[PDB]
Design an enzyme around this catalytic site. Structure first.
Site, PDB file in Angstrom:
ATOM      1  N   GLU A  28      -4.547 -16.870   8.665  1.00 10.28           N
ATOM      2  CA  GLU A  28      -3.935 -18.018   9.333  1.00 10.28           C
ATOM      3  C   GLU A  28      -4.391 -18.118  10.788  1.00 10.28           C
ATOM      4  OE1 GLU A  28       0.199 -17.063   8.938  1.00 10.28           O
ATOM      5  OE2 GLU A  28       0.297 -18.201   7.063  1.00 10.28           O
ATOM      6  N   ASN A  74      -1.766 -19.051   1.747  1.00 15.11           N
ATOM      7  CA  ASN A  74      -0.417 -18.522   1.924  1.00 15.11           C
ATOM      8  C   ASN A  74       0.553 -19.680   1.743  1.00 15.11           C
ATOM      9  OD1 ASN A  74      -1.855 -16.232   2.653  1.00 15.11           O
ATOM     10  ND2 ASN A  74      -1.289 -16.305   4.833  1.00 15.11           N
ATOM     11  N   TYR A 128      10.048 -22.349   3.240  1.00 12.20           N
ATOM     12  CA  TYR A 128       9.940 -22.991   4.549  1.00 12.20           C
ATOM     13  C   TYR A 128       9.762 -24.508   4.421  1.00 12.20           C
ATOM     14  CZ  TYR A 128       8.747 -18.242   6.434  1.00 12.20           C
ATOM     15  OH  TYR A 128       8.716 -16.927   6.781  1.00 12.20           O
ATOM     16  N   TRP A 135       4.048 -11.765  -1.475  1.00  9.32           N
ATOM     17  CA  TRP A 135       4.428 -11.376  -0.124  1.00  9.32           C
ATOM     18  C   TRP A 135       5.939 -11.164  -0.072  1.00  9.32           C
ATOM     19  CZ3 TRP A 135       1.267  -9.918   3.718  1.00  9.32           C
ATOM     20  CH2 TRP A 135       1.873  -9.668   4.968  1.00  9.32           C
ATOM     21  N   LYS A 181      11.399 -10.422   2.425  1.00  9.64           N
ATOM     22  CA  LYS A 181      10.797 -10.997   1.225  1.00  9.64           C
ATOM     23  C   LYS A 181      10.291  -9.932   0.249  1.00  9.64           C
ATOM     24  CE  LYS A 181       9.418 -15.176   3.748  1.00  9.64           C
ATOM     25  NZ  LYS A 181       9.666 -14.671   5.137  1.00  9.64           N
TER      26      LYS A 181
HETATM   27  O1  LIG Z   1       6.480 -15.642   6.859  1.00  8.25           O
HETATM   28  C1  LIG Z   1       6.096 -14.652   6.211  1.00  8.25           C
HETATM   29  O2  LIG Z   1       6.867 -14.135   5.378  1.00  8.25           O
HETATM   30  C2  LIG Z   1       4.683 -14.178   6.315  1.00  8.25           C
HETATM   31  O3  LIG Z   1       4.007 -15.488   5.944  1.00  8.25           O
HETATM   32  C3  LIG Z   1       2.614 -15.738   6.354  1.00  8.25           C
HETATM   33  O4  LIG Z   1       2.031 -16.731   6.075  1.00  8.25           O
HETATM   34  C4  LIG Z   1       2.069 -14.542   7.213  1.00  8.25           C
HETATM   35  O5  LIG Z   1       0.659 -14.376   6.854  1.00  8.25           O
HETATM   36  C5  LIG Z   1       2.729 -13.280   7.087  1.00  8.25           C
HETATM   37  O6  LIG Z   1       2.151 -12.337   8.034  1.00  8.25           O
HETATM   38  C6  LIG Z   1       4.143 -13.353   7.423  1.00  8.25           C
HETATM   39  O7  LIG Z   1       4.792 -12.154   7.260  1.00  8.25           O
END
Ligand SMILES: O=C(O)[C@H]1OC(=O)[C@H](O)[C@@H](O)[C@@H]1O
Ligand SMILES: O=C(O)[C@H]1OC(=O)[C@H](O)[C@@H](O)[C@@H]1O
Ligand SMILES: [Ca+2]
Ligand SMILES: [Ca+2]
Ligand code: NA
Ligand code: NA
Lengths: 840, 837
Positions: free
Chosen positions: A395, A462, A468, A542, A562
């Site tokens: 990102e 991502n 979000y 993630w 998460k």
């Molecule tokens: O917001 C989050 O959970 C994550 O989301 C993303 O896009 C980031 O790459 C990551 O480093 C953050 O930890």
């Protein structure tokens, strides 16, 4: 021969600057005694402003006499973010980069007659080392193993970018045959000539000897000799996959040519596989379609941070492996040798990257330090056949585009950003032609428009639609749009997930209540999209763990929640939704209630209170019992089923049953159930502590008191509940409570709260946190049955914004109701929690 | 009339001394925002040298306009160890004692035109305040509720030793009738006289009016007035037990005599019960025999200290009540009103005491502060029918006997002790003639010899035979000797228990290995003795919780781990042993494996590995299944049964059932099992991490890494194990490890450690800690020196963990580690083997 052992023990540590800390004669007796691995940033698990700066380490080295003639090599597997090494007060060398190793030949600085002082100056404040931004904590200290290796004057090169100095790759691989290329450097640190014998011994997976290669080599004094030996082509090679991790051991030995004395030995694995990424048809492994079933893994553990011992790295791996994953995204930084060993041996494909994140600064040296870290990662991990792709950016437009909204401000930053990307892409392909390059994007097309997606071999998105913002279905929509507009860019979903909190549950889960159930709804949506769409090579969830991010507030300040497993590595229930879907070789039957072991609910009369119990399983059909009563059998879909369970008793036993491959599978646990009456009377008030999560649809169970606070409900004749107002929700951290989530939700503009209850003396507790720092400033009075109990209460004046207030009142009720009314004065009336007990 | 509400919120706080902290205009902006309750000693959960000294609390008071003509009473329910109260910079009062309440009429110092500043200076350094010594942390700060009560100028006295000013007792209680006496004080802070009607309304348990007393009274300006109003004898009264907590509400009201308008009002419960303690037949409640089934309970919770909200107090009480206890020793200090409320209402008999422990020092002012604390406890909790006995000393000879050996030395100290004792004894009986006096002894007949055991109405023995030396059977022997020699001293076993650690398990549990299983052994022996010996009035288990005691090392430093429930209030399996034996009203069936969920064992070939699975239950017969296969029926004795369970699969399901009074009863859980091979070869070494708790008979499972470290085993041909040496054990804390117990045991004078293993490259981790406060030794592996001269205590010091890893190339069929001592002894605290290539 070669002797490699750790020097992790017997260190002294000091936080901050210290003039003279490297001198051998320094007095460090008052420093802290520690044992590597170590971080000085345990404070990040509470404090958002964790310490960034300088820290010093000291250790005595008393060398073995048997080493008097060997070369001593010092290796620091990791120091965040930078390290300078001192031997007996002399600056031996330095290293920039908090996740790659560094190594030094410290022999010219050492003495064998007196003891030596090793001092390391470590710094986690430098702005010319990646990362300078990113959603994790930048822990300082020496948090990976430190070694001494002693070798004879002729030995394999151990000071090539802190690597092993050997490089083994398979130029051609097919089912029919494969080639094998064995390379490295021998170093002659003696003052004279050396005539040596180089031997490669290559073994089959079963341990039998396949081939022995022998070359004589002559090295002038001080020379570095590069060798590159090709083996006999390997016929019908045993192919490697995460399911079948066949490894071929390559033992490389150095011998004095005359005496045949063994000088040095270095062991590695190679393996035979080939892979391909296709924009239409996805990922192929050894010529066959293969869905990448991936997870991402951060490297810390609350509250020791990144100072994990190696059996902890292995423990994390077994958990990922037992869940069914065949693919790990090692991010945003390269990780422990102990991790990659398991990927090779136990079977898991790997992506590995360096942390160039958010924005390319205009800091001299940053580009240069990024280049060195990329080379160090590829060279240090070149020999891990599990790794199929390197990455260097994540990102890289996210903060750029937030900070700069004019074309004039952006043009330089984008130029700098595209130049460094192209720079690193060239370095990658010249460091390693055997692997695929990748890059991870946040959910925006600006990566296509800026040219950033035209650089690496494949791309990662991502994606967090439904967490979000947006709806869950925007996830498959986004991927479909990309595949239409850029069909030649093969795609991995490199991040997806959603936050969750064991303390929070909801019958109507919604994004950002942080309920256990909402993350399941989210993951239950995403996984089948990943499995069943052919142009999606795979995804990497993630994240595997709840991990440290000092800058996060939300439901668990300092933690990104998460994870599929809690910080301490206990799995959440949804871990077993993955396992059910990804493990065909064993039965999976998991009652999804370890995350919900303390339940409560509003009971009408003596009738049961119904609450969902979900099951995760790969069985086609499951039966659920409670205290021996069957609730029927259900057909599973998408690896899950949900029963509406009637709770009554205090300690119910839940029991599940099904058939898998002609055998009986079973599961069970006890939980707690607490009934709360909808209609209060003298009988049912004895022992009652009626607690309400005002303004929320979530049950909140304190992990500190164990008390569950019920979802709000509107007042009804004969019952209890609120009057007026609307739900409100903050994500800012709440001061002065362990139970943040209870205070992040309130009823704004509330008018009253009422319990219909008999005559007597009651204890009323009210809960306040002003979450509208926008503010005029809320101030209000409160009465109960017409008796003022607060004339002008203003939580933000008395305590400030985002800070807990818990106020208890004793009131004598001479009515058949307890009517709490709010009386505005400025701003709004609000109430974040209420709790009632009968005293007399 | 009366308004009571808290001022727990919106404080600022500063650790240490501060110039001008009480000043109304002091700048406390940069102070730490806190919310009561609070302690500044969270450090005590890791640091043994916890901060003892001064702390400052500031909060603004903005008085409601409705209080303009009322009296304001400040109440601090507890602050440790002492507190001084400033209003707008003026010293109003101070209090000595960290577990009793204090109150002050603060009206003269307050304004109603401008905000008032409340500042409190607190001190847990003071050595003139009990306790000065004892097995727990002396937490500092304001860790109970703080109240504002506003009342009319004619109100019940609220500044009599921080109590309610009322005192209700029953002079005579029998099955047929009981008498009731209602006393208290009325104060009149008006500037002229006033005429009042005082009324007592008395309600039956079912809420109905039983009786109304009324008496007229007049008070001159500033006069306080004592009343004591007998009540019509209550006929066929509803008696109170833990099982039947029948309570009579007593409402006392103050009305203006002319206008009849209500002024003040206070509610209190009474109840009807009598009791007595018989040196031969035990305890009697309402004339019937009654076994006292008690636990003790400390008041802190890791890591918040004693800063508990009242639901946490009530949570604690429910676990104790659901375990079947009917008695509670509230020790070593008086505890929260919230707890006492439950002992009355839900039913538990109570012992309550002040922390005068270990040794009566020669400290100026100590005696006086003790007496005041006793008066306070009794006055503040006088109206709690659950309480049947007060106490003021625990083990007051223990440190005295360590510090002074000769008769000459002891003389004065013993004189001070007997004097302070008799003095408090007489203060107790002045303060309350309705309850029984008690004292708690450690296990020495010197409490008899010195005459200490003649002073109180009953005696308590804290007994630890089978834990702190001696034999389990020494417990009943000690008590039978007391009964022989002092038959008129009725006995309670006021303490008994054994440390335990969830990380530790043993097939051969022995005292001070801190295994789950040994604690169970100790308690399974003690409880039948308690139940079945009639001259034992009862006992109170030490302790219900794992609690904070900063000076302790042992397996869990900073923590006394003798709980029945962990510090977070999760129960240990053994909690359900008590519940099996004390709850006959419900079925109890509990597979005793929640403390042992991560199991491992050495496997011969692929035969199953047998490990015990214990069951606690009040059923006579249980059946245990693993993964669906039955292991048979077994008859329970002493509320338990053990099965030798064959483990094999990695995630087995444990299942137990039986019948109770007709109904079928069930329980189950999953656990994790990891087999380790007895004979290593190339196949079984893949993914193997062979970890050995060298020197110990316990499996140790890290709660940090989750790895299990196996019991040491001697080397046998074809397998692996130790060669030479003897077990060695330390209780001192180990620096630089979370896995203390792993390092606190070792094999001393060790000769070798050997693994029979294929050729290849191996990772070998050696764990060292020198516990012998200079050992030096070389270490060789298959004839190659790997350490020329290693001395843990020179490299690292004593009691500090050393973990060293080596990569070893084995060109033989074994890995032979040998120790060559050149000084001191050879020792090894743990080993762990992986194959790499
Ligand atoms: O917001 C989050 O959970 C994550 O989301 C993303 O896009 C980031 O790459 C990551 O480093 C953050 O930890
Ligand atoms: O050492 C122990 O466990 C206990 O022994 C006793 O008898 C003490 O009165 C108590 O305060 C200690 O905690
Ligand atoms: Ca490592
Ligand atoms: Ca309280
Ligand atoms: Na709320
Ligand atoms: Na040991």
């Amino acid at each position: 021969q070669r002797q490699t052992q750790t020097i992790n023990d017997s260190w002294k540590f000091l936080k901050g600057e210290c003039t003279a800390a490297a001198d051998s004669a320094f007095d460090d007796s008052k420093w802290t005694s520690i044992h590597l691995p170590h971080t000085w940033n345990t404070d990040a698990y509470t404090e958002k402003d964790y310490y960034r700066g300088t820290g010093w380490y000291r250790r005595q080295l008393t060398l073995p006499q048997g080493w008097k003639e060997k070369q001593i090599i010092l290796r620091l597997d990791a120091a965040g973010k930078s390290a300078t090494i001192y031997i007996n007060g002399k600056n031996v060398g330095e290293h920039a980069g908090g996740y790659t190793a560094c190594s030094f030949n410290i022999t010219p600085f050492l003495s064998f007659d007196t003891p030596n002082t090793l001092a390391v100056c470590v710094d986690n404040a430098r702005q010319d080392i990646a990362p300078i931004s990113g959603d994790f904590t930048f822990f300082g200290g020496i948090y990976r193993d430190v070694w001494l290796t002693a070798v004879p004057n002729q030995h394999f090169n151990l000071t090539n970018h802190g690597s092993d100095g050997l490089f083994i790759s398979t130029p051609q691989v097919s089912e029919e045959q494969a080639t094998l290329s064995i390379r490295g450097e021998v170093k002659n640190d003696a003052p004279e000539k050396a005539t040596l014998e180089l031997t490669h011994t290559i073994y089959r997976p079963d341990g039998t000897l396949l081939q022995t290669l022998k070359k004589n080599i002559q090295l002038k004094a001080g020379e570095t000799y590069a060798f590159s030996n090709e083996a006999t082509p390997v016929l019908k090679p045993e192919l490697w996959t995460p399911e079948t991790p066949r490894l071929y051991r390559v033992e490389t030995t150095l011998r004095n040519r005359k005496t045949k004395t063994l000088l040095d030995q270095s062991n590695h694995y190679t393996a035979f596989r080939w892979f391909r990424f296709d924009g239409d048809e996805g990922f192929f492994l050894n010529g066959k379609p293969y869905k990448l079933r991936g997870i991402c893994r951060h490297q810390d553990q609350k509250p020791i941070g990144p100072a994990l011992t190696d059996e902890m790295h292995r423990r994390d791996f077994l958990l990922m492996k037992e869940m069914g994953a065949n693919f790990i995204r090692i991010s945003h930084y390269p990780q422990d040798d102990a991790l990659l060993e398991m990927c090779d041996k136990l079977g898991m494909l790997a992506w590995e990257e360096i942390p160039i994140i958010d924005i390319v600064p205009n800091t001299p040296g940053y580009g240069d330090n990024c280049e060195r870290n990329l080379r160090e990662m590829i060279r240090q991990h070149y020999n891990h056949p599990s790794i199929i792709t390197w990455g260097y950016m994540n990102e890289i437009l996210l903060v750029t585009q937030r900070k700069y909204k004019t074309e004039a401000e952006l043009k330089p930053v984008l130029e700098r950003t595209l130049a460094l990307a192209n720079r690193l892409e060239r370095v990658l392909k010249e460091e390693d032609s055997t692997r695929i390059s990748t890059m991870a994007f946040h959910g925006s097309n600006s990566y296509n428009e800026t040219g950033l997606s035209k650089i690496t071999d494949i791309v990662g998105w991502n994606l967090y639609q439904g967490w979000y913002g947006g709806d869950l279905t925007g996830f498959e929509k986004f991927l479909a749009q990309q595949h239409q507009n850029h069909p030649t860019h093969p795609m991995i979903v490199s991040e997806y997930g959603a936050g969750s909190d064991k303390r929070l549950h909801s019958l109507h889960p919604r994004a950002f209540d942080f309920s256990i159930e909402y993350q399941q709804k989210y993951l239950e949506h995403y996984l089948p999209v990943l499995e069943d769409t052919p142009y999606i090579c795979g995804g990497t969830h993630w994240n595997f763990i709840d991990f440290s991010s000092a800058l996060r507030d939300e439901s668990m300040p300092r933690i990104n929640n998460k994870g599929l497993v809690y910080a301490d590595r206990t799995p959440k229930d949804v871990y077993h939704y993955y396992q059910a879907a990804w493990r065909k070789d064993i039965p999976v039957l998991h009652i999804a209630s370890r995350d919900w072991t303390d339940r409560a609910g509003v009971q009408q009369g003596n009738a049961p209170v119904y609450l969902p119990v979900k099951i995760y399983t790969n069985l086609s059909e499951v039966e659920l019992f409670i205290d021996g009563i069957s609730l029927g059998k259900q057909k599973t879909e998408n690896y899950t089923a949900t029963f509406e369970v009637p709770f009554s008793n205090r300690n119910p036993f839940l029991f599940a049953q099904g058939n898998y491959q002609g055998k009986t599978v079973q599961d069970g646990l006890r939980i707690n159930f607490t009934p709360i009456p909808a209609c209060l009377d003298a009988n049912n008030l004895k022992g009652l502590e009626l607690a309400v999560n005002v303004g929320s649809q979530c049950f909140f169970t304190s992990d500190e008191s164990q008390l569950t606070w019920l979802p709000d409900q509107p007042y009804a004749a004969g019952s209890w509940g609120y009057i007026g107002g609307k739900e409100g929700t903050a994500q800012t951290e709440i001061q002065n409570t362990a139970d943040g989530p209870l205070f992040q939700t309130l009823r704004n503009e509330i008018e009253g709260y009422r319990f219909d209850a008999p005559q007597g003396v009651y204890e009323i507790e009210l809960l306040f946190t002003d979450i509208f720092r926008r503010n005029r400033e809320s101030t209000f009075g409160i009465s109960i049955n017409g008796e003022v109990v607060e004339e002008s209460l203003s939580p933000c004046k008395e305590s400030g914004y985002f800070r807990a207030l818990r106020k208890k009142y004793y009131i004598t009720n001479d009515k058949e109701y307890i009517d709490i009314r709010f009386h505005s004065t400025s701003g709004t009336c609000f109430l974040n929690g209420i709790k009632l007990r009968n005293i007399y």
